Amino acid sequence: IIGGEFTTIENQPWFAAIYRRHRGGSVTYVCGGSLISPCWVISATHCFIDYPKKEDYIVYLGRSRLNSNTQGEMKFEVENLILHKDYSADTLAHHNDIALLKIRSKEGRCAQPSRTIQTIALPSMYNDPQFGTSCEITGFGKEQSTDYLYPEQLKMTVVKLISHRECQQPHYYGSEVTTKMLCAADPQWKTDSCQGDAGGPLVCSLQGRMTLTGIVSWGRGCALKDKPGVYTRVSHFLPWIRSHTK
């Protein structure tokens, strides 16, 4: 997250931190995700597409820091790793950039809700807030485009939903953005998601409830003028989600 503010897991208790083990045994951060039910975390397919073996991944819930333990955290293996069959990627856009991870502990359990671990509601079908609505994004991604390191402490910021029309302007992304995506940006371009935030939550208040409106997917650079963050539009994937979690 470029700009914004440091936070803790209490302020986004559905946030999932997804890591990969390496042959040799190092573990590195991969992507964020969102707990949508006790056994299911939702994220982005591009986070996994290159290394799609489920045994390689570890998921933590209740985590506020990247490389140290948070009191109350829970660690999970990935029982099922489900990537979207229609995923595709070009120079820029990632299409159908959505993935589901079924989580299970060494003790065979799903998530136990606590002060630091809760689920986030899915939106209702094809129902998204209007452009100019402020929403929040959360992640462990870079604080500056040029940074080599990821921040050790979780961050969040606020960005505004941008119309499809605006986002499809050629100086923006043209037709790379589809109706299955949502654009969001800061009016001054001063805050944004960045590398390492992918898979994490875009959350908007919708009918007075907090709703998983989007999933961090792609963009050109970070906090770059005329180049919004692009998010998978969750309200357009509900059949896929339900069908794959039943």
């Binding site: 591009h46 990632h94 870079k142 963009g219």
Partner: peptide, 12 residues
């Protein structure tokens, strides 16, 4: 390889 889209990518 400093962008959203390229997290956990081999090519990078």
């Amino acid at each position: 390889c400093s962008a959203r889209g390229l997290e956990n990518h081999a090519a990078c």
